[PDB]
Design a protein around this nucleic acid. Structure first.
Length: 51
RNA sequence: ACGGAAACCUUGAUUCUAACGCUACUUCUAAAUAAGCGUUA
């Protein structure tokens, strides 16, 4: 819709920042993505024993 | 008017010198601030 006409953008989800206000990507986020990739492609972790 | 009188068990002395409540030890281990959008129109 038009951002200056209706309610439109009421809330914006903030990006992660440090104490200086500069955005960055935490290592925990990339590590979680890498861990998902590794766990899904290892047959000894992607089995019914994972539940 | 007594085997009695007179006579300090007294003076000077530091329970003192030396000695680390010390040696070794990561508040550590895994962990995406992320998932779901139905039904009506």
């Amino acid at each position: 819709r038009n951002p200056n006409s209706a309610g439109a953008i009421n809330e914006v989800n903030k990006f992660i920042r440090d104490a200086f206000g500069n955005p960055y990507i935490p290592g925990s986020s990339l590590k979680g993505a890498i861990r998902t990739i590794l766990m899904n492609t290892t047959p000894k972790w992607n089995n019914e024993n994972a539940v």
